Amino acid sequence: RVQSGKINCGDDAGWAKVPSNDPGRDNTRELAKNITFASPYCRPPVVLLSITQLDVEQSQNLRVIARLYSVSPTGFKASCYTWHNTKVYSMSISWISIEN
Amino acid sequence: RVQSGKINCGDDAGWAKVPSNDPGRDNTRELAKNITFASPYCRPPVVLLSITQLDVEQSQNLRVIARLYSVSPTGFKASCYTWHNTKVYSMSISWISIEN
Amino acid sequence: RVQSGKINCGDDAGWAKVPSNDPGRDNTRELAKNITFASPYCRPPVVLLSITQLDVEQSQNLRVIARLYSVSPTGFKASCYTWHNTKVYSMSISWISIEN
Amino acid sequence: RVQSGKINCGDDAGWAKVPSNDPGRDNTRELAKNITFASPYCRPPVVLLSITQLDVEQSQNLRVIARLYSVSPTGFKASCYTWHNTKVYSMSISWISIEN
Amino acid sequence: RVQSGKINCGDDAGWAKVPSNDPGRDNTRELAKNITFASPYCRPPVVLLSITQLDVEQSQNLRVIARLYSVSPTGFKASCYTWHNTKVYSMSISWISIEN
Amino acid sequence: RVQSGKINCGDDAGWAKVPSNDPGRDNTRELAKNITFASPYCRPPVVLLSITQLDVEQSQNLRVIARLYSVSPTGFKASCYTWHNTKVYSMSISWISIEN
């Protein structure tokens, strides 16, 4: 049983300021999403993330992460994540879930 | 039944100028490909796209999309897509298809 | 049988200088990894690579490849790959393996 | 995709007299059924037959076959088959179909 | 996920006398078993029954059923079933369960 | 990966006399077959046996077993098995193998 989708995170002005969990990153910011599968799984599927859209300001470093936090049998938590003075205008993440 | 491949789009000088389908994007340009599976499927598989190569001009914003248009049981349509004054020297997209 | 993981390549100062295999690329450099599956396969699975982290210097072109070299039934070889005067501070590649 | 069912053939008085296709069998008789799957397949599934009910006259030899004739992607043909002076009061055949 | 096993029912002297659920059968008798899968399923698997052993008295009619009552995600109920004056000395039923 | 077939054992006059492995059975006799899969497996598949043909002498008890001895990744050993003064004129066993 394979499912898929796409999280459109958009402009980072609408992204949440979050506390950093890496000593090396300041001004960490994420558009986190708690996605639920249309068809629940028995056990956590394997989930893969793919950044399939990007629009980043050139005067500053490209700093992005497609972050997978957790996968349960019913859904997962993932985020568009940036830090320091990176400016993203848009970012989208495609994903697949596969029954393991 | 899982299949995979890689679309190498190359330099955007050889990419097609296309009409925009987003009010926010001008000078939209794509190297679209109509890929056919070696082994046809019964029903549309799930297809995932992954940008696995990039070479972009730094003096301008990074603007890219790995665009999936449609998936049929026999193939799919996907593209390297850019817009405005982004300059890409190369871009490749890896993909997988999975019987659902 | 689906397996997955993430190769964190880190700062390119710790990356290997390698001989180029493309006439168009000089100063080619890679953090290659020879990954072994926890559960060996019968036949080569299909493996997909996804760049899920990037931190690149803005004063120079973005040049990256998530390179898949080979897939055996027991593992695969993949690398973070860059060239010319691109500077990457970090890069991570997520992957999945699927019994075909 | 796995499907299953059960063909109840009943008393052989309601069974068809058919021409023999084995030089060694006379008075051959079958309750043939042309079963269609609820969900069509892409390719012929593998089908297994299992006799799960029997009620046979003891004064004569037990002669039975659970006969699989053909499997298409949409269905299959199978039969309760007997010959000579065997008397069956009932016979049922369970089956499974599996996407190969 | 495929599981399998074998229910050995043995001599019908140790079988339970049960009330008939078919107007046409008297003296109905079964060795019922409530089998639990080693690995629980998400949803009811498909279960197939196969009589793989038989030892029946010849002076009376062969009357047997390999009866599947119910399949849950955790197990199933099945029985060796006989009726009237059939005498079975042994009967075994093999089974498979398949994730659907 | 599902495979299937049918072992036709024929008349028990051509069957081997074997030493009994059950204290309760004398004159044990089997047409054993060592079947190899067309496509080898990684691990032992699950194999199911189904008697799909029978022709037994009525003046003596019906005594039959569809015996599965062992399953390896490359094949399996199974037999038509009878004992005491049972007379079988023919017996066929259908089987399936399923990657577990």
Side-chain angles (χ1 to χ4, degrees), chain A residues 1-98 100, chain B residues 1-98 100, chain C residues 1-98 100, chain D residues 1-98 100, chain E residues 1-98 100, chain F residues 1-98 100:
Chain A
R1 172 66 170 159
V2 188
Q3 305 177 46
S4 78
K6 147 210 207 57
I7 299 160
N8 288 307
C9 297
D11 193 308
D12 72 7
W15 290 13
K17 214 305 168 40
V18 303
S20 176
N21 61 20
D22 173 295
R25 298 169 188 152
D26 69 342
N27 198 30
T28 59
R29 297 162 280 130
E30 73 169 8
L31 188 291
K33 276 278 110 69
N34 178 198
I35 288 81
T36 316
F37 308 117
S39 300
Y41 284 101
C42 229
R43 305 187 175 288
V46 176
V47 176
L48 186 73
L49 270 33
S50 183
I51 298 160
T52 58
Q53 176 169 321
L54 263 175
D55 185 350
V56 166
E57 173 58 48
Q58 68 77 235
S59 50
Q60 296 299 333
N61 286 1
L62 203 180
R63 304 185 186 86
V64 309
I65 301 170
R67 197 163 169 172
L68 188 63
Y69 279 98
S70 47
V71 184
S72 79
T74 50
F76 65 95
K77 182 177 156 188
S79 83
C80 292
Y81 189 99
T82 193
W83 67 100
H84 209 53
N85 58 15
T86 285
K87 169 68 198 163
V88 351
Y89 301 99
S90 67
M91 173 171 184
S92 312
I93 295 164
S94 303
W95 60 267
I96 35 173
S97 61
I98 307 170
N100 197 2
Chain B
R1 172 66 170 159
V2 188
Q3 305 177 46
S4 78
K6 147 210 207 57
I7 299 160
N8 288 307
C9 297
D11 193 308
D12 72 7
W15 290 13
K17 214 305 168 40
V18 303
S20 176
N21 61 20
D22 173 295
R25 298 169 188 152
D26 69 342
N27 198 30
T28 59
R29 297 162 280 130
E30 73 169 8
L31 188 291
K33 276 278 110 69
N34 178 198
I35 288 81
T36 316
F37 308 117
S39 300
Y41 284 101
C42 229
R43 305 187 175 288
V46 176
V47 176
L48 186 73
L49 270 33
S50 183
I51 298 160
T52 58
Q53 176 169 321
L54 263 175
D55 185 350
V56 166
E57 173 58 48
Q58 68 77 235
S59 50
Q60 296 299 333
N61 286 1
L62 203 180
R63 304 185 186 86
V64 309
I65 301 170
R67 197 163 169 172
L68 188 63
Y69 279 98
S70 47
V71 184
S72 79
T74 50
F76 65 95
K77 182 177 156 188
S79 83
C80 292
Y81 189 99
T82 193
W83 67 100
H84 209 53
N85 58 15
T86 285
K87 169 68 198 163
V88 351
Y89 301 99
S90 67
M91 173 171 184
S92 312
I93 295 164
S94 303
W95 60 267
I96 35 173
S97 61
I98 307 170
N100 197 2
Chain C
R1 172 66 170 159
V2 188
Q3 305 177 46
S4 78
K6 147 210 207 57
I7 299 160
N8 288 307
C9 297
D11 193 308
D12 72 7
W15 290 13
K17 214 305 168 40
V18 303
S20 176
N21 61 20
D22 173 295
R25 298 169 188 152
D26 69 342
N27 198 30
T28 59
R29 297 162 280 130
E30 73 169 8
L31 188 291
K33 276 278 110 69
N34 178 198
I35 288 81
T36 316
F37 308 117
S39 300
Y41 284 101
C42 229
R43 305 187 175 288
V46 176
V47 176
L48 186 73
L49 270 33
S50 183
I51 298 160
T52 58
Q53 176 169 321
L54 263 175
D55 185 350
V56 166
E57 173 58 48
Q58 68 77 235
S59 50
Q60 296 299 333
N61 286 1
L62 203 180
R63 304 185 186 86
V64 309
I65 301 170
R67 197 163 169 172
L68 188 63
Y69 279 98
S70 47
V71 184
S72 79
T74 50
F76 65 95
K77 182 177 156 188
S79 83
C80 292
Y81 189 99
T82 193
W83 67 100
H84 209 53
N85 58 15
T86 285
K87 169 68 198 163
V88 351
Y89 301 99
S90 67
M91 173 171 184
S92 312
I93 295 164
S94 303
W95 60 267
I96 35 173
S97 61
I98 307 170
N100 197 2
Chain D
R1 172 66 170 159
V2 188
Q3 305 177 46
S4 78
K6 147 210 207 57
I7 299 160
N8 288 307
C9 297
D11 193 308
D12 72 7
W15 290 13
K17 214 305 168 40
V18 303
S20 176
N21 61 20
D22 173 295
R25 298 169 188 152
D26 69 342
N27 198 30
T28 59
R29 297 162 280 130
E30 73 169 8
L31 188 291
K33 276 278 110 69
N34 178 198
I35 288 81
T36 316
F37 308 117
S39 300
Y41 284 101
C42 229
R43 305 187 175 288
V46 176
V47 176
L48 186 73
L49 270 33
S50 183
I51 298 160
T52 58
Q53 176 169 321
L54 263 175
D55 185 350
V56 166
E57 173 58 48
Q58 68 77 235
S59 50
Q60 296 299 333
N61 286 1
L62 203 180
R63 304 185 186 86
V64 309
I65 301 170
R67 197 163 169 172
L68 188 63
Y69 279 98
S70 47
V71 184
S72 79
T74 50
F76 65 95
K77 182 177 156 188
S79 83
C80 292
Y81 189 99
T82 193
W83 67 100
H84 209 53
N85 58 15
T86 285
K87 169 68 198 163
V88 351
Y89 301 99
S90 67
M91 173 171 184
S92 312
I93 295 164
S94 303
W95 60 267
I96 35 173
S97 61
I98 307 170
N100 197 2
Chain E
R1 172 66 170 159
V2 188
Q3 305 177 46
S4 78
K6 147 210 207 57
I7 299 160
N8 288 307
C9 297
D11 193 308
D12 72 7
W15 290 13
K17 214 305 168 40
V18 303
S20 176
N21 61 20
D22 173 295
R25 298 169 188 152
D26 69 342
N27 198 30
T28 59
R29 297 162 280 130
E30 73 169 8
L31 188 291
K33 276 278 110 69
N34 178 198
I35 288 81
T36 316
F37 308 117
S39 300
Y41 284 101
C42 229
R43 305 187 175 288
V46 176
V47 176
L48 186 73
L49 270 33
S50 183
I51 298 160
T52 58
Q53 176 169 321
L54 263 175
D55 185 350
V56 166
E57 173 58 48
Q58 68 77 235
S59 50
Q60 296 299 333
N61 286 1
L62 203 180
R63 304 185 186 86
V64 309
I65 301 170
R67 197 163 169 172
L68 188 63
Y69 279 98
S70 47
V71 184
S72 79
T74 50
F76 65 95
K77 182 177 156 188
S79 83
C80 292
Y81 189 99
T82 193
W83 67 100
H84 209 53
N85 58 15
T86 285
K87 169 68 198 163
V88 351
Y89 301 99
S90 67
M91 173 171 184
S92 312
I93 295 164
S94 303
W95 60 267
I96 35 173
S97 61
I98 307 170
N100 197 2
Chain F
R1 172 66 170 159
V2 188
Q3 305 177 46
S4 78
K6 147 210 207 57
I7 299 160
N8 288 307
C9 297
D11 193 308
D12 72 7
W15 290 13
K17 214 305 168 40
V18 303
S20 176
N21 61 20
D22 173 295
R25 298 169 188 152
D26 69 342
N27 198 30
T28 59
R29 297 162 280 130
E30 73 169 8
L31 188 291
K33 276 278 110 69
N34 178 198
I35 288 81
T36 316
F37 308 117
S39 300
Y41 284 101
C42 229
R43 305 187 175 288
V46 176
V47 176
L48 186 73
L49 270 33
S50 183
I51 298 160
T52 58
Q53 176 169 321
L54 263 175
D55 185 350
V56 166
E57 173 58 48
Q58 68 77 235
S59 50
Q60 296 299 333
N61 286 1
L62 203 180
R63 304 185 186 86
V64 309
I65 301 170
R67 197 163 169 172
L68 188 63
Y69 279 98
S70 47
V71 184
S72 79
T74 50
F76 65 95
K77 182 177 156 188
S79 83
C80 292
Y81 189 99
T82 193
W83 67 100
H84 209 53
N85 58 15
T86 285
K87 169 68 198 163
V88 351
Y89 301 99
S90 67
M91 173 171 184
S92 312
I93 295 164
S94 303
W95 60 267
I96 35 173
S97 61
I98 307 170
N100 197 2

